[model samples]
Target: YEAPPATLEAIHPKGLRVSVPDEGFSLFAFHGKLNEEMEGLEAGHWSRDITKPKNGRWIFRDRNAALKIGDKIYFWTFVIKDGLGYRQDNGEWTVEGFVDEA
Candidate 1:
């Protein structure tokens, strides 16, 4: 599906399902508390040179942290890299094709 800006409609356990533009896209799942908020696009004047997002990220990559935004599953990704990468979706839940690059 196509994510229309802030109106990301698709939901899962990973947070909002952001659209990876047909041309392709990339983002960072930081090593902090487990979260799923997309990286805000418009940078503000307060933003530091390149000090990644201060909040809204994840640090769970083993078992299944199962992102839970409110009562809904905004998006979902599993964990199985000692806490640095992720895996598949809601069901059987197995690490398939969604690990962070080293």
Candidate 2:
């Protein structure tokens, strides 16, 4: 079977939000790094296990690593299944300051 689909949902000053299909994988994780430009996966840090899967998917909101507005981050979603690992859904995003509702 093919690997589960992954998505990078949001990138905020405090953390990142990502989701993956609840395909019964052995593990789910997010890895990323703050950088001036996009870089390889080896340059990022692996987040703690995202153990909570709900409503048909696994969502991870990492609040431990704080960032600043205007910072750029490169990130990817990783999945482990049946002893094999898959790395996909790589992207780069610039953090933006929260705007007050009008």
Candidate 3:
């Protein structure tokens, strides 16, 4: 799993394309379930500089609330596959966490 700086930049622009199209199912409707599952989530665009693991150890420098979209809660918390794409419940793994930021 090696990602270049450019790729990371594209995936996470000012309005980082979260919950992007799975690239398989529901092309036009890929984001259909996003708004539902993550209602009121304000994860519009953000950025990250990922460095591939030299020894299989991954690094996600910007997986935090600092890049949050104001009052709106974001669904971009912990990710699976060292931070690849959306890690839905049906994905290879699940990213479950309750961040109490009240």
Candidate number achieving the greatest TM-score relative to the actual structure: 2
Candidate 2 lDDT over 11-66, as tens digits, reads 55556555677766777766665563335555466456665676778866665445
lDDT of 3 by residue, 1-102 (tens): 221111111112123222321222211111112222344443334444222332233322233323222222223332234234433322121222223221
The whole-model lDDT of each prediction reads: 0.26, 0.60, 0.26
TM-score of each model, paired residue for residue: 0.17, 0.54, 0.21
Maximum-lDDT candidate: 2
Output the lDDT of residue 6, model 1.
21
Residue 83 accuracy (lDDT) in model 2:
73
Flag regions of model 1 displaced more than 4 Å: 1-19, 24-33, 36-63, 71-102
TM-score sort, best first: 2, 3, 1
| Candidate 3 C-alpha error for residue 20, in Å | 17
Question: Tens-digit lDDT track for model 1 on 1-102?
Answer: 221122122233433222212112223321212333223322211111212222342222222334333322223322323234433232121222233212
Candidate 2 achieves a global lDDT of: 0.60
Which model, 1 or 2, shows the larger lDDT?
Answer: 2
Q: In the order shown, what is each candidate's alpha-carbon RMSD?
A: 14.4, 5.2, 12.7
In candidate 2, where is summed lDDT lowest over 10 consecutive residues? 93-102
